[PDB]
Structures are given as structure tokens and as C-alpha cells.
Symmetry: D3
Subunit: 157 residues, 6 copies
């Protein structure tokens, strides 16, 4: 019945993302993780790799599924008969560009956005910073699921 | 059966609050609006008056109910078999509210979902509406119709 | 003989910008909208100027001009020393703050910031272009003229 | 016939306030400093007005008046519809933002914010009073007149 | 030789404070914890209680000592032949009022302020919020040192 | 023997940077200014030129030395037997810098101490000073005297 979409590029998914997935899956009947792909810029991981890494670390969430898309998020959401987005937030600054997008999305499509504070322990990991730290050899094994860490090191080598 | 609690003093409820209630009621199977009773600061409206104003404003939300509460919010939430709070936000306070959300998650496993106010209601607050009205300012576009009527009576 | 300059790329001008123009025009005798030439945008400078002129026809004390280089030189060369800029958030206040203090330091030009109308809090030229590109309806966020012009650039 | 109102409690007026007054006076034909009567402060309204008048003698187009109630009524009753307020941080921008939007909504009064001079970024009436109370030297942060007056209230 | 002062009301000290003490003690030759007392408002704990709770949870920091004071912090600092303050920070908002005070303190006394980000795990505890939560019965045992938690519950009962 | 590293690109060093260097040198037994070499973005001055400008500006700081570095900052710090970074801050970025500080603490046990810029230098940055100077703006009050001389030469 109820449902929410958790969007991102997830390149790769982090433990901060997984925390948000788990919290959304606990509060909505269904959750769709939307892996949003830019057709004009390849990330580090292909779409299939991104989805596989997410599925492997969400196997214990029976009401969660993972799908890719592109274009307007609100179309992805509405085409699935839903009208809620759930996004994780770390800071007041995150709240301002995300605020702009949430109000635009409500304006153009009537889709609501719910924000959740990520857990303190994952508050400083981002996909981008984990990739940058790993590139120059820093240890990020505690910030990423097992489904990700060594695949990341493999990409870098 | 999903559910969330929308907490506040609501003294009085504003259209900003109502917008949050509507969005919560659209996304959860049940919503409870929790009206704080505070033994120290007694504001402008009694708890009963505040509950009545909220019920009038939410008459079209069948899955939303209004109740008073006291003490620790997460106790109120867990006592009703729920473990989610929904709160409206205007600015990045994402900061004091963030502290509270992480504290509430830590002590009781209760999650908090924040939603941005509609742009049109982003500058209204109960306190500022009362202050403006006290001096003859017109805040009728920022409050439910019934609240505005009741507010003018308390000022006379 | 008061006056202020309202700067931007305006690619395209939005109703948020127009709101700021109207407020500046209501409080200063003379307003100049300063359109940056910075050549990777959607509209040419001439088109951007046209769209602003079209949308500001009811503001007799406002004119529109293009410029390059330091904004403070554009302002001072026209005998003014005030900039009027619209602001949506505290984050915008901090980087605009740095610029405002730099501009005051190097040229004695003051910067006045005004809050967006609540209804345009979330519109920007770039987000409007992005949403429209993927088929979203931004007609309520742009001057009627601009909206038709945008459709023409995408189709 | 342009004009703006600069509001505050000014208890006492600081060099940060004076900087904002001077900037408002340079860009508007008429400036009114609006001193709130809100009776728990250090100086009486008359003393606060005196200190501002003393510090603004070189600003011929500025006057100082006391008021109560809604600031927008003070502004409108004098035929104006602009407020000029100084800002130090993004945090100040957000609660002042709420007020500015409320004031625009209820009375059509616009609010222009200006960044403090860097040198007065950290001075406020309350922090100056607090520091002086415990013996700290705030003489570089207040008009010469005000500083002597403050010493007299503490001793 | 080198030295810093860690100020606060510490009513009571939290694990967030202790983290900051430990980090200052690791980077400066001596650290003084300055327990600042308002003679015009009693807190929950008396000065002696505050100091005892701090000493008991800093026994393994040999270069740290604890002293109370009042009035201007910069006088406390300079009277001890020091000119640095170390303070913990959680948010961008914390950085703004603290910024104002740091620049005032440099202006009036030449004293520098160094800020450190508290550990993620303690980022949401404050003395005030711990007291408020404990007052209404919430479990804050993991946010306070052993020297504090039951003494706090005792004050409340 | 206490110590800290002050990292940056310093392209060129500003009076804001120098103020941070001076405060660090006053509070730690040794300070190392770490000048980043970045293979991708080659800015206005070479690493050697940047080191020379910093050494000129810090001639009166005997316990401060200047070195170039590459890659992970915490490796640079630990390789020199230190575990503290000192960085200057202008605004609440306390946010991206906070993320980085917590990351650096997590991966290598290196702490970060932030200090507020002097009010007078709070709006200067290397990037904005270059941009202003490129168009004939006068930034001589915001840079060390020698930097200003060298900067005018690169623009000609
Ligand atoms: O947003 C707010 O103001 C709420 O936290 C009020 C609130 C705090 N504790 C409560 C217990 C029962 C009902 C409401 C409350
Ligand atoms: O503040 C900054 O820009 C620093 O992080 C630069 C920086 C990042 N990694 C480094 C390695 C060696 C020397 C400097 C660096
Ligand atoms: O706000 C902005 O986007 C920029 O200030 C625009 C700008 C910079 N320099 C200029 C010179 C002339 C005209 C406009 C400009
Ligand atoms: O900025 C402030 O401190 C307040 O806006 C001051 C203020 C509120 N209402 C007023 C009416 C008349 C004169 C000043 C005021």
C-alpha cells in the first residue's frame, strides 16, 4: 500500500545509504531504491554493478527492490504509483540544495520528500569521498558494505 | 499498518502545520498529532482548545487523530506502537532538530522524517503569528479559518 | 539621484529575478540590470537582454545592459555604488558575503541583499532549464515570454 | 523621494550599527533610525537616541525616532516601505529572513540586508556590555561618546 | 611549554567533552579544564561535584588539570601564562556564535581559539539535552562517563 | 615535541593563510606548511614559486618549515611523526571541512584544529584575489608584499 523511493547514483552504495534504506523499509510497505544513471557520464561502476552491490547488502529487507532509471526522478516515482521520496541528510547545507529540489518536485509532480538524519557513525562517508580516499590508499573498509569494498579496490587497481 | 506521530505545541495550529499533517496522512496508514501539555509555560490556548482547532482543520483526514501528551516524546510514540516522528522544517532548524532526532533514535529506536514546508507557509510560526496579530497585523492567510476567528477572541 | 545595479547571467531570467528587479526599482531612482557576458549557456546575451526588457516594460526606471570583467567597474562606470542581489538561503549569504566584502574593499561599492518571494524560493535558471529539458512544467516560474522562448530552444 | 528605516534596540549603538547607518544614508534620500521601546536594558530610550544622534551628526539625511509595536507600522506611518538591516552570518539571515517575509506579507514593506564591515563582524551590543562589565577594552568597537557613557553606567 | 585551556560549564561533563579533553591533551604539553561558574545561577551540580566528575574520568591524562573560575575566560587563560583555548564543535551554527566570541577574545586579549570536531558518536549529546532527557526518564548511560550517570540520576531523584 | 601541519595549495599564499601560520607557530613546537602538488589542475604558480612565496612571508617563524606533498594528507602528516592538522575557517566551510576532519580522524587517527581567520582577512581567498587582480582590481592589502609583486608579473 504505502511506499517510498530512495534515489541516488550509488556509485558505490555506502553504509550511510544502507542505513537510510533500512529505515525507509521499516516505515513504508514497499521501498524502491532508484539507481539514477547519467547517460552522458560513466561513473566508476556500471549500472549492473551498482545494483548488484545494493542487492547483496539488502538481502534481509524483503520489501525493498532495486531499479535503475534516468531523467526526472518524479517520473520514476509516479510511474510506480508512488508519490514519496526518502533521502538521507547529513548537514544544514545538505538541507538547502535538497530543499530547492524537494519544493520543485512537489511543484511539478505533487511528490513529497521525506528527509532522515543519517546515523552518526556514517555521517562523514559519501560515495565521492570514499572513492577519493581509497584512490590514494586510505582505509575505508568500515564505511562500505562487504559487497563494495574489495570491488572498489579492484576498480582502482 | 504503518504510522507516524506529528508533535508540537500548536498554539495555535498554522497552515504550515496543516500542510505537514496532510503530507504525513497521505504517506502513512495512521498519523497521531501529539499536542504537548507543558506545566511551566502556559501559552495562549488551552490544550483542549488546541486539540479542537486541530480537529476542525483536519476534518478531511480520516486516518489522522489528535491526542495530548506529556514528558518524553519517544515514550508517547512507543506507547502507541509506533516508532516514527514526522516534523516540518523551514531552514537548515535542521541543526537543533538533527540533535534531537539522533538523540531520539539512540534512546528509543524512534526514527524522524523531516519534510520541507510549502513555500507559501515557510515564514509562518505560531509565535510570530500571535505577535503580529497582537498588534493588529493581518495573519488570516496563514491560519486555518477557524483558528483566525478564535485568535481574535483571545486578543479582545 | 539614487541607483543600484542588479547583476546576473539571467539564462534565462526567472520570476525570482523579476521580483528582485521590481523591488529594486521601487526603492531606487535608477536600476540597471547587468547581464554578464561570460563565454557555456543556453541563450545569447542579446536574447537574455531582450527577455529581461520584455518582462520589465512596466518598470520605467529600469534599463538593461551587458557587461564583462569586474562588476564593480560596471557599477562605478555608471556613477553608482550599490548592488542589489536576491538571496534564498543562509548558504547563499556566506559566499555572496565574501564577494560583497571584497567589492566594498576594492571599490567602495555596497551590496544590498533581498529575500526572494516565498513562491519563487526554489526557482533558479539552471533548475528551470533542467526540469524543462526533461518535460517538466515550469510555466508558473518564468515570465510568459521567456517560457515560450525556452520551449523553442528545446524543440 | 527614497527612504529606509534602520531598526534596533541599540543598547548601546555600536560601530557596527553606525557602519550600517552610514551605508543606508549613502544610498537612500532619507533614513530613519527606529529605536525600540520594549520595557530589561542598560540605557533608557532617551539615552540611546542621544548616543545615536551624537554619533550620526555627519549624516544630514538621517534622523532618530523611538517606536513600539509592529515595525511595519512605524515604517508605513512615515510614508516609507523599506527596512535596512545589518547581517553578520548565515544564521542571522535565516531568522531575519522569516521576519522579512512576514513583513512583506502583512504590509508590503521590503527588507534590504547589508553585510557588516569585516572589522565589526564580532561586535554586538550585548557582547560589548558583557566584556566591558568584566573589565575588557571595547573602546575600539564603540563610538567615542558611547564608550565614555558605558563606563559611567558600570562605575 | 605549550598549553591550552578547555572551557565550559560542564554541568555535567559528557563523553563529547572528554573526547575533546583527550585530543587537546594529546597535542599540547599541558591542558587546563576551566570549569566556569556563574555566581548568579546555580546549575545542577556544585563546583566541587563538577570538578570531581571530570577528574574521575580524566585520571589517565597526566598532563591535564581541572580548575574553576568566573568572569572573562581570557583572564583565566592569561593568568596561567597561556594564550590558547580549545573548544569542541558540532555544527556550522556552533561555528557562528563561537566565531563571534573567538574574535572578540583575540581582539581584547590576544588569545587564540582552536576548534575541534567532536567524534561522530558524541555529536548529539550536550549537557543540557542529557539532563532534559534524563529528567523525563530517557536512557543516557552511553553518553556520559561512569563518574556522572548515576550522580545525575541521584540529583533528579 | 608538539607539532601540526597546515595544508593547502597556496596559489598564492594570502594574508589569511599567513595569519593562520602565525597562530599555529605560536601554539605548536613545530609547524609544517604542506603545499599540494596536483598533477591535474596546474594553477598560476609552480610549487617551487609557491614555496618561495611562503618562505618569504614566514621568515620570522623559526619553528615553521615549508614542504611540498602529494596524495593523502594524513600520510604526509604521519610520515613526519605528527598527528595534527591546523586549518583556517571563514564560515559555517565548517561543513565540508568537518566531513574531511572526521574522515581523516577515522582513517589515520589524525586530528584537525580549526581557527577563525582574522576579521580583516576573512573575505580573501587565493582564487578571488587572482580573479580580482586579473581585471585590475587592487588586492595589495590582502597579500604579502612579495606575493603582490610576483602576481603582477604573472598577469603581464
Ligand atoms: O515538536 C515538539 O515541540 C514536540 O517535541 C513536543 C513534545 C515533546 N514531548 C512530547 C510528549 C507528548 C506530546 C508532545 C511532545
Ligand atoms: O587544505 C588542503 O587543500 C589540503 O588538504 C591539501 C592537500 C591534500 N593532500 C595533501 C598532501 C600533501 C600536501 C598537501 C595536501
Ligand atoms: O551575479 C553574477 O552572476 C555576476 O556578478 C555577474 C557579473 C560579474 N561581473 C560582471 C560585469 C558586468 C555585468 C555582470 C557581471
Ligand atoms: O530590529 C529590531 O530589534 C526590532 O525590529 C526593533 C523594533 C520592532 N518593532 C519596532 C517598532 C518601532 C521601532 C523599532 C521596532
Amino acid at each position: 500500500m504505502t511506499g517510498a523511493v530512495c534515489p541516488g547514483s550509488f556509485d558505490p552504495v555506502t553504509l550511510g545509504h544502507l542505513d537510510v534504506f533500512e529505515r525507509a523499509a521499516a516505515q513504508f510497505d514497499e521501498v524502491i531504491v532508484a539507481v539514477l544513471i547519467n547517460p552522458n557520464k560513466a561513473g566508476m561502476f556500471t549500472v549492473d554493478e551498482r545494483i548488484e552491490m545494493i542487492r547483496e547488502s539488502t538481502a534481509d529487507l524483503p520489501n525493498l527492490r532495486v531499479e535503475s532509471g534516468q531523467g526526472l526522478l518524479v517520473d520514476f516515482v509516479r510511474e510506480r504509483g508512488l508519490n514519496a521520496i526518502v533521502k538521507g541528510l547529513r548537514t544544514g547545507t545538505d538541507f538547502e540544495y535538497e530543499l530547492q529540489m524537494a519544493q520543485m518536485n512537489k511543484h511539478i509532480a505533487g511528490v513529497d520528500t521525506f528527509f532522515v538524519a543519517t546515523a552518526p557513525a556514517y555521517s562523514f562517508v559519501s560515495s565521492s569521498l570514499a572513492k577519493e580516499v581509497a584512490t590514494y590508499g586510505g582505509d575505508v573498509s568500515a564505511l562500505l558494505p562487504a559487497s563494495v569494498h574489495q570491488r572498489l579496490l579492484g576498480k582502482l587497481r
